[PDB]
Amino acid sequence: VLGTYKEIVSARSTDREIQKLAQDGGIVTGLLAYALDEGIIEGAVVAGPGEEFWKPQPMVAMSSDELKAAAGTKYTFSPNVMMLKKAVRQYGIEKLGTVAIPCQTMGIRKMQTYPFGVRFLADKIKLLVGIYCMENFPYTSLQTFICEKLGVSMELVEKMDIGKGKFWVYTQDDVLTLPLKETHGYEQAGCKICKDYVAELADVSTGSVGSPDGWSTVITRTDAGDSIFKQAVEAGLFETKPIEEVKPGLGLLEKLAAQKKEKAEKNIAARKEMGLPTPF
Amino acid sequence: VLGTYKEIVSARSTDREIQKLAQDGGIVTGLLAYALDEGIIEGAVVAGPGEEFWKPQPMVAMSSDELKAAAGTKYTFSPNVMMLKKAVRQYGIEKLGTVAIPCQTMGIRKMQTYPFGVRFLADKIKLLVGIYCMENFPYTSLQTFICEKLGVSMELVEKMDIGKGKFWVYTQDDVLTLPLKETHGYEQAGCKICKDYVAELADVSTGSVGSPDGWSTVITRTDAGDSIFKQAVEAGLFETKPIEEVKPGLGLLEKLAAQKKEKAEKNIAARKEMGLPTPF
Amino acid sequence: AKPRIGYIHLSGCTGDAMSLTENYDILAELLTNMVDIVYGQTLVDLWEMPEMDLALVEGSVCLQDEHSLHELKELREKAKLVCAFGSCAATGCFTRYSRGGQQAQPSHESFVPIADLIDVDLALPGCPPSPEIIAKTVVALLNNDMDYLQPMLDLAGYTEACGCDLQTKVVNQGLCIGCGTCAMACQTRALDMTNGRPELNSDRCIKCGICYVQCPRSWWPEEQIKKELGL
Amino acid sequence: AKPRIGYIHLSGCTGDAMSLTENYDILAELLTNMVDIVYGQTLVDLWEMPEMDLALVEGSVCLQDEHSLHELKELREKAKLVCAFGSCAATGCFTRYSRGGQQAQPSHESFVPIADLIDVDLALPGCPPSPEIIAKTVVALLNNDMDYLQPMLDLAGYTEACGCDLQTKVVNQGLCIGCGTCAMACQTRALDMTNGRPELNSDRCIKCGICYVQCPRSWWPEEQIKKELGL
Amino acid sequence: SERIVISPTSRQEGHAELVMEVDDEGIVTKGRYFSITPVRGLEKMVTGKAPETAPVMVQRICGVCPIPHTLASVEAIDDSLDIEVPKAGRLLRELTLAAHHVNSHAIHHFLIAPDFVPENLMADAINSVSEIRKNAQYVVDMVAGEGIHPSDVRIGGMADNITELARKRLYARLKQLKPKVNEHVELMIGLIEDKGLPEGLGVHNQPTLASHQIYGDRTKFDLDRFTEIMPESWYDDPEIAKRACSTIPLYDGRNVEVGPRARMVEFQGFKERGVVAQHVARALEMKTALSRAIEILDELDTSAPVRADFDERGTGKLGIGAIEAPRGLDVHMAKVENGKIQFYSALVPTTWNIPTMGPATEGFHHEYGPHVIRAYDPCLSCATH
Amino acid sequence: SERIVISPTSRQEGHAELVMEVDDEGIVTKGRYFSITPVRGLEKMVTGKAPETAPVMVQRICGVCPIPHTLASVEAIDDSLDIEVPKAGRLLRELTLAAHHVNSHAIHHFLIAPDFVPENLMADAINSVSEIRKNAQYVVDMVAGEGIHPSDVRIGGMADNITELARKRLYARLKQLKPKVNEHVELMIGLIEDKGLPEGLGVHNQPTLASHQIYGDRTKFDLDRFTEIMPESWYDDPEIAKRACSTIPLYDGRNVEVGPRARMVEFQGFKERGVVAQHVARALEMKTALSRAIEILDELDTSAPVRADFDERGTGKLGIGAIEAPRGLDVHMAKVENGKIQFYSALVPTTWNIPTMGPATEGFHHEYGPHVIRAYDPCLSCATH
Ligand SMILES: Cc1cc2nc3c(=O)[nH]c(=O)nc-3n(C[C@H](O)[C@H](O)[C@H](O)COP(=O)(O)OP(=O)(O)OC[C@H]3O[C@@H](n4cnc5c(N)ncnc54)[C@H](O)[C@@H]3O)c2cc1C
Ligand SMILES: Cc1cc2nc3c(=O)[nH]c(=O)nc-3n(C[C@H](O)[C@H](O)[C@H](O)COP(=O)(O)OP(=O)(O)OC[C@H]3O[C@@H](n4cnc5c(N)ncnc54)[C@H](O)[C@@H]3O)c2cc1C
Ligand code: NFU
Ligand code: NFU
Ligand code: SF4
Ligand code: SF4
Ligand code: SF4
Ligand code: SF4
Ligand code: SF4
Ligand code: SF4
Ligand code: SF4
Ligand code: SF4
Ligand SMILES: [Cl-]
Ligand SMILES: [Cl-]
Ligand SMILES: [Mg+2]
Ligand SMILES: [Mg+2]
Ligand SMILES: [Mg+2]
Ligand SMILES: [Mg+2]
Ligand SMILES: [Mg+2]
Ligand SMILES: [Mg+2]
Ligand SMILES: [Mg+2]
Ligand SMILES: [Mg+2]
């Protein structure tokens, strides 16, 4: 239920600046930064700051500072795929990295295999880092959670997080939570038929689930993914532990991945009974 | 081949101003003017002067002067139907007249019978005068005839006319002609499947064919058409002769109407053999 | 025995029902003696859906609203004929532009014409359909005038519409003759004419289909037209 | 025995043929040793159409041009496979906006995708299709890779396209997930994203269909994607 | 206590649910009213699009009252673009709304006729309503292009002026309509009083919010007093709070009443409160609306310009359009920049009224609850947009 | 006399017909060349539409040379709107066209290779052409958005500037390309001379029309000298005159030659005439075009603005965009008013050349006729639009 992979480990960036800024282990920022510094990539598309608090905008990062400015999760839309072609046109990039949730990874891989309208982009993608995803929210839904239910505002939120059955918001001196089931019905309806939890088609996939706080569960998949991540570890940019030696460990990851797939198949079947078009 | 009618006559306006301005007998201008003066209509949509010579624009006429300014034929597009709803909204008209070639008459009658998207217009049309038509031309085709083949310009044309196998242009001191067959292929392709020569669905239909120069062949059809035209005659606004007593007479009209229908059926059949959509 | 009619409002704006009621002179006689409006809480205090001869279904249906979906399913079971009443129900109309994200239901996103989920027997496109087409349709059903109603039955299959249909279905096909009927009909004034050809202002198009509906070259109901003219 | 290919230019702009030739490194080997371009006067001095294994047909067809129509009919007779090469041939693309009236042929007005007149076996939408999709398609045909080509066969039926397809076929259907793939792909930059949903600038849309083609939620070729990734 | 649920409430526009907790005697102890109308999402629809698109789409919020949405939209956009509309265009906008009030209040009389009109008078009442609407709608069709979803209210003014033929035709018909509207209003008020609803039914202590007596006034909508919260922080039943489809706009931190009674209280010295007062105010406002339309038709210069030129790029200015819709204050807010709508929000009358309506059923038998609701002339497609 | 008809002529873009009347010895006594390409009708397509639409649609006149149509369109519209484009945007426009010339002339070498390149050198020539096009097209893709139908040439300038990464990458590749282009040009010129075409083939007395050596200059296109007539008043065979699909633009009342030879004659002191001269001029212009692109990349400020703000309503001013396309002077004329294209006309290089091309076959055996045609590098989708 985890897709095809080469190795699964628990990992954390060794860079204290990245540790301070990261959602979890800082795998995305650390790995893109390493690839950039080594010349494996010349830039990366990331979810950078936007025009409202916690409302990111895709942007092409071409320095470690810009990668770092994009660190941390925003649980709303950042259509990262939209900037991939700009990145190889006026930005001049011929070796591109990006971070993508599973559905974005799908649009990208579909483009590479079938680039009907997409000229001279497919072979320029050198590192696709996938991050785990169970649902995403319209911005107004985040506002309902944060401004209405929890009684603060978007500007008071220093970090948001999802895990252990809860939606979490950290303020300057307070930790506020909602039961995650309370967010049901507020996510975009398109997520209902999504079968991919751990970004099965990415070069390397990473998320918090299966690892303790401040660490990440890292799944290497393709030759490029495994080799680039192993390189960074060898260069001492990540600390790693076998996933079997870590709590909660792989059992929880596999449980959630199987839950997501079962739910999706039920919803896909419901669509077909209604006669609605379904690509799955 | 002439559609349903009550009477056919040869006629000419008795108004010398209208005689001077008219294409033929001045039936359209004379009849709309009579209806306006009698309060049978409060305005009429006509093909008035536009922004280029001989390139008319539909307009709502609410005086005899405006009707007179629209007199005379322009053998290019004037989509008169487009102004019918404006005429009953801001112009305030509840009794409307218009002049229409056969395909425009069809759009209007279709609207009256099936006014899906057309609120409070259908019953306001009180007089629909149809004019005979065999083809219409894009403006550039007229320019080819006039500016290129005949070696003058649109501004030098005082009148244009079609008849007796020729396209005619009158200048300030010269009459220039082309064989009408020379205009084949320059008309809009949509005319190929048109079966209606004498505006069969109009209240009253009129044209030059069948009558001598300066006279018109007038076919009354509906109760409204026959009664309004008979009223105008009785009021001495038209002189009429039985069509059987006039040269060339009805034989030529019937010949051309039958030619048009045979041509259309051949072209309609050709469309169907190609698998192209055809409403006829 | 008066025809039993339901008026069911889904994600509509009630403009279609309002248009029906702007048959001013006949309205009292229509509602009291000609037809029997037996269901639709806009008009009738009844919360158990009865059998109907005709359901006038106004509005598109939201895929994320369970009650709308159940109500649509139930009316299909209980009505002999279903009419898509107005272009939102018939073609999606301007709800084709909805994309969710708004309070107080950010997940309410997806709207489709009702034929995407159920069999539809006839349609009245228009935004709203004119008081006249609504009255003529009801009278036709009253009198079993099936010759008159045939275009309404046919239009049940026209569920995705746009002003570009004038190009793809008329101009591109060699059928346009520059009459201007489409521009006359357009209820938003999205259409003009340029050199005798329709000119679409996409910023004003509500995807209602009326321009193509009224075009004399889309379908040509000659016998019914002549019948009414006495020709 | 090299595949016999015709390149037939109807009312196209030759951009598709140019894209094919921007497979720079392989072009000499392609033309000389891999395939045999046997017809198409853009490339070959031959005025008697031969039998072909594949016809790459570029451009829409003008209903008012007799030679275009005859040429299209003849190539259907003489080619085993017909490919609509580029969105003008496949969907009409920007010629969907043509409406006649221009010198020196004011009657030249009506342009349609070639499937409106003949059976089409596969399609390459794009304006133009990328050098990569063209090369991959030819190699696939060379190697009888029918698993790879299935979406091209399927796309033969997608002949009327517009940026509004993202609404009518994805957002309206509850399928959009805000990835931005459509906006990435659009070759005219007609698409942006607003609150995670596609935003169409109709003034730049050429009706090519590429946004819906690339959308991961229109069709999902999972096995071929994984095959190429080694997953 | 026991729960009485009516879903949807009847003879209003659109779908809402009423939930009444009642005691042993059936008296409402706790009332909640909320939208269950799906969110078509007009605000988020027009965000990102050209300014010309917004009035076309937002008027389709509602086909009972599309006129004030078209007006609030173009007024908000005019304000964002710093446009000064010519006098004749301002008059035609005002005339369109005044005529619209007559039509809309008549529509409400149609909807409530089963409650108030005796069976033997029912044909007469429908015919009275219909003749009134026919004449009101001549104005909206001729001036604004279509009687439902008028096409010709535009950014910068109106699409066009009308003819003298139109002006004088409309004038005569509206003036000759005065005695008929006066008779109709007298009749309706008598019947509403005759129903014998209990004294005090629907009386509450919420503010009456109104910007103008008959058109609208953005200078009377104070953003230092306005806030907006969501059902999740308003309703105290979490299942209801999650189902509710409309937002909760507040003034001075409190929920309010908008509509004819609100305007009559704030501008015409009206002192009556509650259900009967709401109907009576609405009927009396027909006199106000028809009189104003007649005077505008007398004043109008048909030869004068009706539309300003304007640069549609914008400067990022927040524009406010505040219109007195037949059901109450209708505020649209729009920000134009880079030639697009960057921000759009609509606070529609029934949106304001919904939080007030549920509690206003409390203290009387639940059988009166539905009558409390209809007194607001609620419009749920409006409320939800 | 006897008629030799070639329809369509081969190894050019698009479809034209060549008709040669020949004497007993096969010598052409009367030559006529005309478009039989259907009229997609770009001018009438963009008339009535928003200005932003015109560059998108008219670049699709031709996929061999879309770059100069996009440029002529935005220059005509800029001129109509009185826009002053910022320096970096002007440089990026010029750079895009300079790179485009290299690509396009290389495409013509591909098309004429069967006539001039020995079989044993054919693989080498295709590979040479391809490496040259690959490097030229890096520029057009990175700067202008797509190498065919570039999206990012815009009214007011360009959509965006490029990075230093892009600028320096392009600079190195074009400069390192210089020796390859020099070798290729030397090779092609030698082969063209080696074919041994008869002395004087294609020499005519028509004017050479050119506005600039490498970009374009609207001040050199004189409307007091320009006229346009139709085939019906040009061709003296009425069947041909009715079939011909392109218009007949004239300068000083006469038909002209445009293109590389025209530019070389007017701006670089080139004195050779006829078919061989036309090929030689075109090859030599690759040196000019590549050198200019290299210098622009050296000069470019990547941090500077590339696009002006503008009000798109217009004032009814006729705007002229005159661009030196690879095949010759490409003039677009556009009038913007009321925020729409009120008038549009394109006079495209092959449109100019067509009336000159037929007569230029006269005086030599008809077997040379097709070689006279290809010397013009004709583009019939361009000619017809
Ligand atoms: C919508 C969403 C849902 C997720 N749900 C879960 C899940 O189900 N299970 C799980 O274990 N992990 C979840 N994640 C993943 C997680 O929160 C982390 O982003 C991941 O562990 C990477 O952390 P890091 O410390 O390695 O990366 P960091 O070094 O913190 O960098 C984070 C990277 O993520 C990118 N990013 C942030 N927000 C978005 C966005 N909205 N869209 C695209 N890219 C973005 C940033 O640009 C940055 O490059 C979710 C993430 C998102 C965005
Ligand atoms: C495109 C076209 C083709 C025709 N071909 C023939 C035909 O086949 N046989 C025949 O006998 N007659 C032909 N006519 C009809 C004819 O030329 C006259 O218009 C007709 O006889 C009326 O003349 P009159 O003196 O009665 O009208 P007048 O008093 O001269 O008034 C003429 C009226 O026609 C209207 N009109 C003029 N041009 C147009 C236009 N392009 N579209 C719509 N309305 C217009 C004017 O607004 C005016 O109201 C054609 C007319 C048109 C417009
Ligand atoms: N009146 C009214 Fe509407 Ni259908 C409400 N509520 C509003 O603007
Ligand atoms: N170069 C070039 Fe084109 Ni295909 C030509 N002729 C023009 O603008
Ligand atoms: S659950 Fe799937 S469809 Fe939804 S945002 Fe996450 S990866 Fe995308
Ligand atoms: S021939 Fe027919 S279709 Fe053509 S313009 Fe005349 S009436 Fe219209
Ligand atoms: S079709 Fe028009 S009037 Fe009918 S529900 Fe839709 S928006 Fe309202
Ligand atoms: S109504 Fe039809 S035939 Fe008439 S102009 Fe419009 S599209 Fe053309
Ligand atoms: S152009 Fe007008 S009539 Fe046609 S679909 Fe658009 S809004 Fe409806
Ligand atoms: S699809 Fe695009 S590149 Fe191909 S012929 Fe059409 S306009 Fe040209
Ligand atoms: S590519 Fe498809 S799923 Fe992704 S944002 Fe566009 S329409 Fe939605
Ligand atoms: S939005 Fe873009 S990709 Fe989609 S049809 Fe339009 S031009 Fe093509
Ligand atoms: Cl507007
Ligand atoms: Cl632009
Ligand atoms: Mg932090
Ligand atoms: Mg005269
Ligand atoms: Mg909510
Ligand atoms: Mg011609
Ligand atoms: Mg006064
Ligand atoms: Mg709101
Ligand atoms: Mg320098
Ligand atoms: Mg031209």
Domains of chain C: 1-159 (3.40.50.700), 160-231 (3.30.70.20)
A199: which 2 tokens? Answer: 């970004």
Q: Give the dihedral of Cα atoms E276, E245, E379, E333; nearest 10 deg.
A: 110
Window 286-315 of F, Cβ < 8 Å to E: 309, 311, 313
Range of the domain at B40: 1-137+185-280
Instruction: Say if residues B148 and F233 touch (Cβ distance below 8 Å).
Output: yes
Measured between alpha carbons, how far is E261 from E207 in angstroms, rounded to an integer? 11
Tell me which DSSP letter residue C209 carries.
Answer: -
E269: which 2 tokens? Answer: 């010295």
E329: which 2 tokens? Answer: 């204050």
If asked whether residues B179 and B191 sit together in one domain, one would say no
> 């451009």: which residue's tokens?
D59
Which string of DSSP letters, residue by residue, matches C124-138?
E-SSSPPHHHHHHHH
Q: Give the chain E residue whose CA is nearest to the CA of A148.
A: E233
The closest of E140, E262, E272, E250 to E213, measured between CA atoms, is: E262
Nearest CA to ligand 11 atom 3: D176
Measured between alpha carbons, how far is A163 from A182 in angstroms, rounded to an integer? 13
Nearest CA to ligand 11 atom 4: D179
Instruction: Say if residues E35 and E16 touch (Cβ distance below 8 Å).
Output: yes
If asked whether residues B146 and B162 sit together in one domain, one would say yes
Q: Count how many domains chain A has.
A: 2
If asked whether residues A26 and A95 sit together in one domain, one would say yes
If asked whether residues B60 and B75 sit together in one domain, one would say yes
Nearest CA to ligand 8 atom 4: C179
**CA separation (Å) from B212 to B68, B182, B208, B252, E370?**
22, 24, 8, 12, 77
Chain D partners within 8 Å of F245 (Cβ)? 104-105, 108
The closest of A149, A160, A131 to A186, measured between CA atoms, is: A149
Measured between alpha carbons, how far is F108 from F280 in angstroms, rounded to an integer? 12
3-state secondary structure of A198: coil
Sign of CA pseudo-dihedral F75, F314, F148, F43: negative
If asked whether residues B160 and B206 sit together in one domain, one would say no
| Residues paired with E5 in a beta bridge | E19
Which string of DSSP letters, residue by residue, matches E121-166?
GHHHHHHHHHHHHHHHHHHHHHHHS-SSS-S-EETTEES----HHH
Q: For D65, what's the count of Cα atoms within 13 Å in the CB-facing half-sphere?
A: 28
Q: C130 in ligand 7 pocket by Cβ < 6 Å?
A: no
Query: F82 vs chain B: nearest CA distance in angstroms?
Result: 25
Which string of DSSP letters, residue by residue, matches D64-123?
T-HHHHHHHHHHHHHEEEEEEESHHHHH-GGGGG-----TT-TT---EE-GGGTS---EE
If asked whether residues A78 and A148 sit together in one domain, one would say no
Domain final residue, candidates B127, B160, B184: B184
Which string of DSSP letters, residue by residue, matches B146-215?
IIIISSS-GGG-SEEEEETTEEEEE-SS-EEEEEGGGGTTTS-GGGGG---SS-TTSSEEEESTTS-TT-
Tell me which DSSP letter residue C11 carries.
Answer: B
Neighbours of ion ligand 21 (CB under 5 A): F 295, 299
Instruction: Say if residues B159 and B72 touch (Cβ distance below 8 Å).
Output: yes
Tell me which DSSP letter residue D173 carries.
Answer: G
SS (H, E, C) F168-184: HHHHHHHHHHHHHHHHH
What b-and-e string marks burial along C131-150, b requiring 16 or more CB atoms within 10 Å of the CB? Answer: bbbbbbbbeebeeeeeebbe
If asked whether residues A166 and A252 sit together in one domain, one would say no
Contacting partners of chain D (3+ CB pairs under 8 A): A, B, C, E, F
Rg of chain A over Cα atoms, rounded to whole angstroms, equals 18
Instruction: Say if residues F375 and F279 touch (Cβ distance below 8 Å).
Output: yes
Which of D95, D186, D189 for mutating ligand 12's site (highest number of atoms within 8 Å of CB)?
Answer: D186
Measured between alpha carbons, how far is A240 from A236 in angstroms, rounded to an integer? 10
If asked whether residues A4 and A74 sit together in one domain, one would say yes
Chain D partners within 8 Å of B186 (Cβ)? 106-107
> 């392109």: which residue's tokens?
F246
Query: F159 vs chain A: nearest CA distance in angstroms?
Result: 10
Asked if residue F98 has a cis previous peptide bond (ω within 30° of 0), the answer is no
Measured between alpha carbons, how far is E131 from E189 in angstroms, rounded to an integer? 18
Which residues, other chains included, contact F258 with Cβ-Cβ below 8 Å and sequence gap of 6+? F208, F209, F210, F327, F328, F329, F349, F352, F353
Best residue of F42, F43, F234, F242 to probe chain B, by most B CBs closer than 10 Å: F242
**Known binding-site positions of A:** 23-29, 47, 70, 72-74, 76, 103, 133-134, 191, 194, 197, 206, 208-209
Q: Determine if residue B98 is left, alpha or beta; phi over 0 gives left, psi from -120 to 50 gives alpha, anything else beta.
A: beta
Instruction: Say if residues F9 and F354 touch (Cβ distance below 8 Å).
Output: no
Chain C partners within 8 Å of A276 (Cβ)? 63, 116
What stretch of H or E contains F154? Answer: strand F153-154
In terms of residues, how long is chain B?
280
3-state secondary structure of C158: coil
The closest of D154, D139, D123 to D228, measured between CA atoms, is: D139
**Amino acid type, A197:** Y
Pocket of ligand 2, beta carbon within 6 A: B 22-29, 46-47, 56, 70-76, 78, 80, 99, 101, 131-134, 136, 162, 206-209, 216
Phi and psi torsions of A161, nearest 5°: -155, 155
B176: which 2 tokens? Answer: 């220039």
3-state secondary structure of E365: strand
Percent helix, strand and coil across chain D, each to the nearest 5: 40, 20, 40
**Known binding-site positions of A for FAD:** 23-29, 47, 70, 72-74, 76, 134, 197, 206, 208-209
Instruction: Say if residues F249 and F347 touch (Cβ distance below 8 Å).
Output: yes
Measured between alpha carbons, how far is F271 from F276 in angstroms, rounded to an integer? 12
3-state secondary structure of D168: helix
Asked if residue E8 has a cis previous peptide bond (ω within 30° of 0), the answer is yes
What b-and-e string marks burial along A143-161, b requiring 16 or more CB atoms within 10 Å of the CB? Answer: bbbbbbbbeeebebbeebb
Q: E62 in ligand 3 pocket by Cβ < 6 Å?
A: yes
F163: which 2 tokens? Answer: 């990075």
Domain final residue, candidates A128, A149, A184: A184
Measured between alpha carbons, how far is A152 from A170 in angstroms, rounded to an integer? 11
A68: which 2 tokens? Answer: 């770092």
D208 marked as part of a ligand binding site: yes
Helix axes F87-116, F122-144, angle to 10 degrees: 160
F189: which 2 tokens? Answer: 């010129």
Question: Pick from C63, C100, C117: which is nearest to A138 by CB?
Answer: C100
Q: What angle do CA C214, C218, C220 make, to 5 degrees?
A: 85
Breaks in chain D (C–N beyond 2.5 Å) sit after: none
Domain boundaries, chain E: 1-385
Measured between alpha carbons, how far is B180 from B182 in angstroms, rounded to an integer? 5
Query: A90 vs chain F: nearest CA distance in angstroms?
Result: 5
Cβ neighbours of F315 (radius 10 Å): 12
The closest of E214, E183, E221, E218 to E285, measured between CA atoms, is: E214
If asked whether residues A228 and A91 sit together in one domain, one would say yes
Which residues, other chains included, contact C29 with Cβ-Cβ below 8 Å and sequence gap of 6+? none
B28: which 2 tokens? Answer: 């359209």
Domain with B162 in it: what CATH number?
3.10.450.750
Are chains F and C in touch, 3+ Cβ pairs below 8 Å? yes
Are C210 and B116 inside 8 Å of each other by CB?
yes
Measured between alpha carbons, how far is B83 from B72 in angstroms, rounded to an integer? 19
Q: Is F169 on the interface with A (CB under 8 A)?
A: yes
Sign of CA pseudo-dihedral A92, A94, A95, A98: positive
The closest of D49, D68, D59 to D17, measured between CA atoms, is: D59
If asked whether residues A191 and A270 sit together in one domain, one would say yes
If asked whether residues A84 and A204 sit together in one domain, one would say yes
> 């209606």: which residue's tokens?
B196
Q: Is A141 on the interface with C (CB under 8 A)?
A: yes
If asked whether residues B260 and B201 sit together in one domain, one would say yes
- F1-385 is classed in which CATH architecture? Orthogonal Bundle (1.10)
Are D228 and A111 inside 8 Å of each other by CB?
no
Q: For D113, what's the count of Cα atoms within 13 Å in the CB-facing half-sphere?
A: 33
Q: Is D132 on the interface with A (CB under 8 A)?
A: yes
